[PDB]
Write a protein that binds this ligand. Structure first.
Ligand SMILES: [Zn+2]
Ligand SMILES: [Zn+2]
Ligand SMILES: [Zn+2]
Ligand SMILES: [Zn+2]
Lengths: 1282, 660
RNA sequence: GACUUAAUGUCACGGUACCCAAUUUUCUGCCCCG
RNA sequence: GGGGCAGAAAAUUGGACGAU
């Protein structure tokens, strides 16, 4: 008897199970499951704190297995003394069965002891087994135990209180995934305890013999897996801050609510959560985004007065008061508290209860059928141990899902059934350590290895729980010899947040209730990887899988471990593979001296081969890739990659709307950015790289296939075996195709890679900018002469038929021609695809599979007032009004976006825009594009709108001008209207003319075509490109020879249009056509002096005769709507449009000429491009005219096929009089169209024409009704009034 | 005057779903919608919800539990979870009450029926004492209106089963119309305690069971009733178990294949109780001699009906789709959308029917002798035999060549546990024996048994043995000796030079299409491919031809030109099936697949064999086809188990499967 | 040395929190009378 | 004699086939 003391050290997070002695174990399944785990006991009432220990029976079983395996190697001849086989068998009638029964395969050898073991003399194996002793099955005294195993107690430093289970262990949910569906079937919860601090246990053996000491001591260093973690045994000689943050969040909520801006606090909480990535400097030195320059109020979110003071100052004081708890914790707590208070104020907590699911199945049923199966290896083949060390790198943002940090609490993980849960701030969470470090759990790695081995073998079994006899299939046999280790990185920065939505296939808008965020980790992160195999020979399938996970030059690693694999999240590459070999037959003493290599694997990886410990030798027989039969036959042909580069010739934009509120610039939408971790430099990146999320890729492909095949419109997918449910998966099957991100690869060849583009909504009545209806866009600079190249790949699983490959190729081709744009604002020319290019690395089957002008000749008679008075002396008003009285047509049924209908048609129109008068379109990105502010401070200098150095017209202006023309043409509602004070302006308007709200009452022709807030439009416009002409209208006398200085442009005043409340709103406002820009041209020397250099602007001015080319794409259109759109594009000769700045001065006249129109039809075989000659076009305008006549209410013109006379309908006639150009077809008509200035003795006076507002609106002459009559009637003379 | 939060829509929906005027297929979606409405209402108001909504939720959960059937031998977890949620909701509703009579009666009714279902499914969580107390309290509350709801019928029947006396409610229980015949029989047996009216009523119930599919609760109720009657040492269960077995067979003849795999497999207890019923007659009391043989013939017949029925059920792509559905159903996946009598045996033949009595833990062996026209039976144990078989399988799956000692030990154990295989009276000497084993004896080689003597003798040295998975495989042309070989190693250059074949033998590189197009019905087909049997998913078995073709399903589909043929194949073919057989007695080897397509006899190997043994067998076979396998095995050296275990191990692996 | 094990028998390294979902829909950087 | 607008309206999670 020597009283040896054994101290136990862990190196992996071990598991905890609550203690029940022997009878309460049968009642709770958690205790029955965790028989081989550490046990936790409560000390004191309240379920607050207790103690942890490991039972001596588990250590005894581990030691017994150790001696069994050790004696199996030496044929039961350990250090020269024979050993017998043992018994491992108990008769139930003569004596009581042991508390634990055995199910594994007992290793047995030949009985070479030539004697029978009894109390008098026995082998050391019998002495360790306790086979012949005075004590058994009952504990009375400790003196009779020849061998003993006392309980092991934890060692802890702080002992002011008890262990307080909360900080020692953290609960989590493990899973079981079915092989052929990829979805979970059942889950179970276990407690995991850290090893850095509470990972030491101590106990005593108290052996009362010296014959078996040499075997017991050697067996101690052989046990590796105990309590679910690697180990070695050797002998020895503040919720108050939460309350305060809650009160401050409450006062912030009250202050936000007092300003009727309650809904903004959700975005505020999201921004607070986002600020966790930036350091404390973002709040210390005031780096938060500021408001616009010279504006009274600052930021719409960060400059809201909370209890008088600004939000930034309140946040500063809050951080200064809670500096002790840290920055990350403060930000997370503030965000969570704000979200909870906002939800409580809204009226819901989003309980999210589950019905008929959430199965928690534990392995249960071992009362009988006990067997003892001996396994006797021959006297030949040796047993050797292989250790594999390497590093795992993430080629894509990984994701390891865990439950919310409210159900992860150790002691109260689950109370009872029907327990409604509370959704936290973040729906999807990531796995982190107690030091906030990323972790790859052993369970996920082991499951991935199991699945890969099952695939490599070509056959396998689903894991059976509670089986009486061990599985004898190849996968289980090979997995029983594999030991893995947990991996923890050296990176502790906070994870990113990725947002996802869903789109309704019918209205092509967002789905009601689909908005969530996922936490993802950075790419390029490094994790350790240790594998151990103990067997006779190294399997070829395991080596094939190892080569399959490896990444080298020319081959990419493929280790799909983690979650969200459909969106390409969780692909890993394993590098720096070094395989060493342990000889366990002749070098067992050295394997005992150093306990394998446990806990020092990193050192083994780093050191060279010269300082290798004795006994370990490099393994030089590892096979290459092409020499393995499991590989390249079962593993390599599983996933096939298809990568390509997409060229975008448009300003692609992928908004985030959350990083914009944390970065300087004061911009609403900023393009998406990613952070990638670098290995050589342990920082992230000097500059983030722009990319497009893989979710958009997957959605685009899925919707393309769905609209191709029409399965997107099915109301259900129960028992579905359609194309979409097979290629893309559903809620019961995993997707067969996996998508990755689209990264930008040519960003180093762009200067000012991103462009600033502003936008505005124009009122239909006032003709000016609407109140609080201005915003800006900050996309990437995309141009036809210099496009953006985005490289991305998707993976295809083995087993695809010809039809599915056909579908994928057709979807790729339909992406190529430009039907589905990328990003937002696709209807105005954002993110349009010019073409795709496939490199020479895709599968050969895929590569071989992928490969007269129109004239209207319509003339308009025009007004007679300027025609007869052809010489001079007539002044007209710059703008007139059009009045359509009350009737608006509402279309009850709505053309869906779900499929391409067989009766409707779709296609593209190529149009040419040529100017009649010089054009002005400013590039408002910079305020001084010509550098004239040095001499004259406060002056605004603008250049023409350009991207990457070429002139280009934005598509939003064209869309708006065509929308206004179509709305006036089809007698539809006022899409943009300002309901404010001068009753109010909204009361004057007729109720039927109010803007469309909701789809219940229908959609007017203007809103049904161009689109509304809950129905995406069917017409998409593109950016106009310049080709030819004379540019830069030259004026001698200006510092720049190509610039014009305009006059004062003041806000529109409705008071002149509508007199006192007995009157009625006139309607839309339109501007005339006149060459009035020469008046501004000839008095530059007077306008630059008499006008203060603060109320006028100077811009680059184009010239007449310049041609622009733009295209219009449309889908799912009827015939009459297309005819009406064609007529709106061009109404014939001597009728044009107005577009640009200076319309009142005659500075925006443009003529649109239709060049070609292509119609393509999809319910045909595959597709086809047509030309649609002039006959079909003329038929389409005829159909549109018939539709307009039917809308008129009376059949004035009988049915027939003749050239349509548009001047029969009164409102069409007025509109065409309003857009009639009087100087096109060699006519000497030069009308004068200007404003009265203010009074007499004013600059610009005519001096003798009494054309002043004093004599015009004095109510003495020219009464109110006559004034409105003159304003309504187009082309009515004013100075010689009627 | 209507509450803003009402549950009448769900109550109407459940009421409509209750009556049998709705399609069984459409019953689940509508009740799921009602449950969704109720759960949304509960989520809207967390703890201020009224008791009636809780009652409706519990009712919906009880119905959703009853609309789930116990497939296979393991009950799905969704039924148990639904019952647990329903009982929790009913307890919450009971704890706080608004105060009513009908509401309380309905709440206690739902709680009682949920508790009865929970106890029937498992007795550990809801023991008999708590169920008795709850049900006694419910019957105290006054739910005795037997003419309106059948839940009261169930409460009364379970109350009678549990032990209390209900002599008062008997007349109104019998006068009720909702009760069925089994409940009437239970009431007559547990109240009046008479054996005539109960006999007649449950006899009519059994006669009405011939059309009920094998998914209703009625089968389980009959099984439980007969089990309890057996437990009380009654003299009234033997005949009724016999008739319910007859009804089970009749319904078995009119069921689908996937339903045969899922729902029919849980009637092994019924097929066992009827086996015991017949075995209880033909006993120490002495009736006429002929009734002894008639009873034993009936015992053999019932033991035969539990044999491989899935394989008996076996334009081209429909069969492939059905086979894919079957194989995906074997792994518990989703499946989304003229008989020979037992006496007709050739003269000089003895047939042995094996049946493993699982209820009593015993084994039965029934023997028919044609020359004597006699029937005999004997009993034995199979626990230690199973243990030794598992030990041999585990050792062989890891070493595959040094487990010969375990094979010898297994043969000795078979000889020890079955001493009647060498008795003069049981199996006559110099006779031919046929084996129809059961549920784990297919894997044991019964032609290698050694008697427990000083120097034991093998079973082959005196008897010639043949194998047959079931008696349903027994039934009741050309002379081409076609050959197919894909041995890359060589060592068969002395065999291909024979001119006994022609125009059909693929000497080298034989592939699947060389076997698919065979249409001459050859007299002898020889295949020399590699075996590579599959343990998990035995539906492949991977018969390795050149292109990796016919594994196991192409045999059942792609070959139709081997009817009446004799096929000898050298490869690991007829065994290495999983030790744990299945939820039902089935044999899945490509030898059985070849027997299924129309082949007469198949010679397969129990495990890995050498090239020399196969070459010797194929050379010794074509000399004269009328020689059996026993003489070749005896002359090869199979009697050398004591001195050289490996040669005995190599010699025994061959087995004959064809009954002529 | 209790709380805290039973000794001729502990495969829990027997179980990937897995599957489904386009940050997207509408909008001319435009504009004169107290 | 004089400058306004500089974001507004919604979505902030739903569901997850087991056999008449
Ligand atoms: Zn011993
Ligand atoms: Zn297995
Ligand atoms: Zn589908
Ligand atoms: Zn409208």
């Amino acid at each position: 008897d020597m009283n040896i003391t054994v101290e136990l050290t862990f190196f992996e997070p071990y598991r905890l199970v609550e203690w029940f002695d022997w009878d309460a174990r049968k009642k709770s399944h958690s205790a029955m499951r965790g028989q081989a785990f550490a046990q936790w006991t409560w000390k004191g009432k309240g379920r607050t704190a207790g103690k942890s220990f490991i039972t001596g029976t588990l250590v005894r079983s581990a030691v017994i297995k150790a001696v069994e395996e050790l004696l199996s190697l030496n044929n039961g001849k350990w250090e020269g003394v024979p050993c017998c086989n043992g018994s491992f068998q108990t008769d139930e009638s003569k004596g009581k069965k042991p508390s634990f029964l055995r199910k594994r395969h007992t290793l047995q050898w030949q009985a070479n002891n030539k004697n029978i073991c009894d109390k008098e003399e026995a082998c050391p194996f019998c002495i360790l087994l306790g086979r012949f002793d005075n004590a058994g099955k009952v504990h009375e005294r400790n003196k009779d135990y020849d061998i003993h195993f006392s309980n092991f107690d934890l060692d802890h430093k702080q002992e002011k209180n008890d262990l307080r289970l909360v900080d020692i262990a953290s609960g989590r949910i493990l899973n079981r995934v079915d092989f052929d569906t990829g979805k979970a079937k059942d889950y179970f919860r276990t407690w995991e305890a850290d090893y850095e601090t509470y990972g030491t246990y101590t106990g005593r053996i108290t052996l009362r013999n010296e014959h078996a000491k040499k075997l017991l001591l050697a067996s101690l260093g052989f046990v590796d897996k105990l309590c679910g973690a690697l180990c070695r045994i050797e002998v020895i000689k503040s919720e108050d801050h939460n309350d305060e943050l809650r009160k401050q969040a409450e006062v912030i909520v009250e202050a936000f609510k007092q300003n009727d801006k309650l809904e903004k606090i959700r975005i505020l909480a999201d921004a607070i959560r986002t600020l966790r990535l930036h350091g404390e400097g973002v709040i210390e030195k005031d780096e938060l985004p500021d408001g616009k320059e010279e504006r009274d109020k600052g930021h719409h979110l960060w400059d809201i007065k909370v209890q008088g003071t600004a939000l930034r100052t309140k946040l500063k004081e809050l951080w200064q008061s809670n500096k002790d708890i840290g920055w990350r914790k403060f930000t997370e707590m503030l965000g969570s508290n704000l979200y909870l208070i906002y939800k409580k104020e809204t009226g819901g907590v989003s309980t999210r209860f589950r019905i008929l699911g959430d199965t928690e199945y534990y392995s249960k049923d071992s009362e009988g059928s006990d067997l003892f199966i001996p396994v006797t290896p021959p006297e030949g083949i040796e047993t050797k141990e292989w250790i594999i060390v390497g590093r795992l790198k993430a080629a894509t943002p990984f994701y390891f899902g865990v439950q919310q940090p409210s159900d992860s609490i150790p002691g109260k993980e689950k109370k009872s059934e029907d327990s409604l849960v509370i959704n936290e701030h973040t729906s999807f969470n990531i796995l982190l350590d107690k030091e906030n470090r990323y972790r790859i759990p052993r369970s996920a790695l082991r499951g991935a290895l199991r699945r890969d081995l099952r695939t490599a073998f070509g056959s396998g079994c689903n894991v059976s729980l509670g089986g009486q006899i061990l599985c004898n299939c190849k996968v289980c046999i090979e997995m029983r010899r594999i030991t893995l280790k947990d991996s923890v990185s050296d990176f502790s920065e906070p994870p990113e947040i990725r947002y996802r939505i869903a789109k309704n296939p019918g209205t092509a808008t967002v789905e009601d209730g689909s908005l969530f965020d996922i936490e993802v980790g950075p790419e390029g992160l490094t994790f350790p990887f240790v594998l151990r195999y103990r067997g006779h020979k190294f399997p070829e399938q395991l080596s094939s899988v190892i080569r399959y996970w490896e990444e080298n030059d020319g081959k990419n690693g493929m280790a799909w471990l983690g979650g969200l694999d459909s969106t390409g999240k969780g692909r890993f590459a394993l590098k720096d593979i070094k395989i060493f070999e342990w000889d366990l037959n002749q070098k067992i003493n050295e394997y005992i001296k150093e306990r394998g290599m446990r806990g020092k694997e990193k050192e083994l990886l780093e050191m060279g081969e010269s300082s290798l410990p004795d006994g370990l030798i490099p393994y030089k027989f590892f096979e290459e890739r092409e020499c393995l039969f499991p590989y390249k036959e079962n593993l390599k042909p599983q996933w096939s990659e298809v990568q390509y580069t997409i060229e975008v010739g448009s300003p692609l934009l992928t908004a985030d709307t959350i990083s914009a509120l944390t970065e300087p610039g004061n911009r609403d939408a900023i393009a998406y950015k990613k952070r990638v971790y670098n290995d050589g430099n342990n920082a992230i990146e000097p500059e983030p790289r722009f990319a497009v999320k893989s979710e958009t890729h997957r959605g685009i492909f899925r919707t393309a296939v769905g609209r191709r095949t029409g399965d997107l419109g099915k109301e259900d997918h129960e028992d579905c075996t359609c194309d979409m449910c097979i290629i893309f998966g559903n809620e019961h099957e995993s997707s067969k195709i996996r998508f990755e991100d689209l990264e930008l690869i040519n960003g180093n060849e762009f200067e000012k890679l991103e462009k600033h583009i502003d936008h505005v909504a124009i009122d239909r009545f006032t003709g000016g900018a609407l109140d609080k209806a201005k915003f800006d866009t900050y996309p990437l600079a995309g141009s036809p002469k210099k496009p953006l190249k985005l490289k991305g790949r998707f993976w295809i699983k083995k087993g695809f038929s010809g039809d599915h490959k056909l579908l994928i190729t057709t979807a790729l081709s339909d992406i190529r021609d430009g039907l589905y744009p990328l990003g937002s604002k696709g209807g105005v020319g954002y993110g349009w695809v010019a073409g795709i290019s496939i490199d020479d690395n895709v599968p050969d089957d895929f590569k071989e599979m992928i490969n007269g002008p129109i004239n209207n000749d319509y003339v308009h008679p025009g007004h007679q007032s300027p025609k007869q008075d052809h010489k001079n002396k007539n002044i007209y008003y710059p703008h007139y009004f059009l009045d359509s009285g009350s009737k608006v047509y509402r279309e009850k049924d709505i053309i869906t976006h779900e499929e391409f209908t067989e009766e409707l048609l779709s296609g593209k129109i190529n149009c040419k825009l040529e100017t009649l008068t010089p054009l002005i379109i400013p590039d408002t990105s910079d305020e001084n594009g010509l550098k004239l502010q040095g001499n004259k401070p406060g002056h605004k200098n603008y250049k023409f709108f350009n991207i990457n150095g070429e002139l280009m017209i934005p598509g939003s202006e064209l869309r708006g001008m065509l929308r206004t023309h179509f709305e006036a043409l089809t007698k539809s509602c006022f899409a943009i209207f300002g309901e404010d004070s001068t009753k109010t302006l909204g009361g004057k308007l007729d109720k039927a003319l109010h803007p469309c709200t909701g789809l219940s009452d229908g959609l007017c022709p203007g809103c049904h075509l161009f689109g509304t807030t809950d129905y995406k439009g069917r017409v998409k416009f593109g950016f106009a490109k310049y080709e030819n002409g004379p540019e830069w209208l030259i004026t001698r006398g200006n510092n720049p020879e190509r610039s014009l200085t305009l006059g004062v442009l003041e806000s529109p005043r409705p008071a002149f249009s509508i007199p006192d409340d007995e009157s009625e709103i006139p309607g839309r406002k339109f501007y005339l056509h006149h060459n009035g820009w020469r008046i501004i041209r000839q008095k530059q020397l007077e306008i630059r002096e008499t006008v203060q250099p603060e109320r006028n602007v100077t811009t680059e001015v184009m010239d007449k005769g310049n041609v622009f080319s733009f295209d219009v794409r449309f889908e799912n259109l009827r015939e009459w709507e297309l005819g009406l759109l064609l007529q709106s594009l061009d109404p014939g000769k001597n009728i044009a449009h107005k577009l640009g700045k200076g319309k009142p001065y005659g500075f925006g006249s443009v003529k649109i000429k239709i060049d070609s129109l292509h119609t393509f039809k999809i319910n045909s075989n595959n597709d086809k491009i047509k030309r649609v000659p002039q006959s079909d076009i003329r038929e389409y305008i005829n159909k549109g005219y018939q539709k307009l006549i039917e809308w008129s209410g009376n059949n004035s013109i009988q049915k027939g096929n003749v050239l349509p006379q548009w001047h029969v309908i009164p409102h069409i006639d007025k509109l065409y009089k309003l857009l009639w150009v009087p100087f096109l077809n060699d006519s000497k008509l030069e009308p004068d169209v200007r404003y009265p200035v203010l009074n007499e003795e004013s600059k610009g006076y005519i001096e003798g024409s009494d054309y002043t507002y004093k004599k015009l609106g004095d109510k003495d002459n020219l009464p109110y009704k006559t004034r409105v009559k003159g304003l309504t009637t187009p082309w009515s003379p004013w100075n010689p009034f009627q | 005057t209507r509450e803003d939060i009402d549950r009448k829509e769900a109550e109407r929906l459940l009421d409509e779903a209750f009556n049998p005027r709705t399609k069984p297929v459409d019953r689940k979606k509508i009740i799921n919608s009602a449950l969704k409405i109720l759960i949304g209402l509960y989520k809207e108001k967390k703890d201020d919800l009224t008791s009636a909504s809780f009652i409706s939720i519990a009712r919906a959960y009880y119905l959703v539990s009853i609309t789930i059937l116990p497939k296979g031998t393991t009950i799905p977890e969704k039924k148990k979870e639904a019952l647990r949620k329903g009982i929790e909701f009913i307890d919450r509703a009971i704890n706080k009450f608004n105060g009513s009579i009908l509401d309380s009666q309905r709440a206690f009714r739902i709680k009682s029926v949920l508790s009865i279902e929970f106890n029937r499914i498992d007795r550990e969580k809801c023991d008999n004492i708590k169920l008795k107390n709850l049900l006694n309290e419910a019957v105290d509350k006054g739910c005795t209106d037997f003419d309106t709801y059948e839940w009261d019928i169930q409460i009364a029947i379970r109350l009678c089963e549990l032990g209390v006396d209900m002599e008062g409610h008997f007349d109104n229980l019998i006068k009720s119309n909702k009760a069925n015949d089994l409940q009437k029989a239970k009431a007559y047996y547990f109240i009046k305690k008479d054996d005539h009216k109960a006999k007649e009523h449950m006899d009519k119930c059994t006669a009405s069971l011939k059309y009920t599919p094998c998914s209703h609760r009625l089968w389980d109720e009959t099984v439980g009733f007969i089990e309890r009657l057996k437990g009380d040492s009654s003299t009234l269960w033997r005949d009724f178990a016999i008739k319910t077995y007859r009804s089970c067979r009749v319904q078995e003849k009119e069921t689908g294949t996937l339903r045969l795999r899922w729902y029919w497999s849980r009637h092994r207890v019924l097929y066992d109780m009827a086996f015991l019923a017949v075995k209880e007659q033909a006993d120490d009391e002495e009736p006429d001699v002929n009734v002894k043989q008639a009873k034993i013939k009936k015992l053999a017949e019932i033991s035969d009906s539990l044999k491989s029925r899935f394989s008996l059920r076996l334009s081209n792509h429909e069969f492939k789709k059905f086979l894919d559905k079957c194989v995906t159903a074997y792994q518990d996946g989703y499946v989304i959308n003229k008989l020979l009598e037992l006496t007709q045996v050739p003269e000089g033949w003895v047939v042995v029917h094996f049946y493993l009595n699982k209820l009593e833990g015993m084994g039965n062996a029934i023997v028919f002798d044609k020359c004597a026209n006699s029937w005999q039976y004997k009993e034995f144990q199979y626990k230690e035999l199973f243990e030794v078989f598992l030990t041999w399988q585990a050792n062989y799956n890891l070493y595959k060549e040094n487990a010969a000692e375990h094979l010898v030990t297994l043969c000795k154990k078979i000889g020890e546990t079955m001493p009647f295989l060498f008795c003069d009276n049981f199996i006559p000497n110099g006779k031919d024996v046929l084996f129809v084993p059961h549920d784990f004896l297919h894997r044991l080689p019964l032609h290698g048994s050694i008697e427990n003597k000083t120097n034991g003798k093998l079973f082959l040295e005196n008897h010639s043995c043949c194998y047959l998975p079931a008696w349903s495989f027994a039934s009741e042309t050309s002379d081409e000796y076609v050959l197919l070989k894909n041995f890359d190693q060589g060592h068969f250059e002395t065999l291909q030079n024979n001119q006994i074949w022609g125009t059909q033998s693929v000497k080298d590189g034989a592939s699947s299409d060389d076997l698919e197009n065979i249409r001459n019905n050859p007299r002898l087909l020889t295949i020399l491919c590699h075996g590579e049997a599959n343990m998990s998913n035995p539906f492949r078995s991977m018969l390795k031809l050149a292109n990796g073709g016919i594994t196991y399903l192409e045999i059942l589909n792609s070959v139709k030109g081997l009817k009446g043929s004799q096929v000898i194949l050298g490869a690991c073919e007829t065994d290495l099936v999983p030790p744990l057989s299945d939820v039902m007695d089935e044999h899945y080897s490509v030898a059985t697949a070849l027997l299924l397509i129309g082949a007469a006899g198949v010679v397969g190997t129990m495990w890995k064999v050498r090239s020399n043994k196969t070459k010797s067998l194929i050379e010794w076979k074509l000399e004269n086809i009328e020689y059996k396998l026993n003489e070749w095995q005896k002359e090869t050296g199979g009697a050398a188990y004591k001195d050289h275990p490996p040669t005995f191990y190599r010699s025994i692996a061959f087995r004959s499967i064809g009954f002529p």
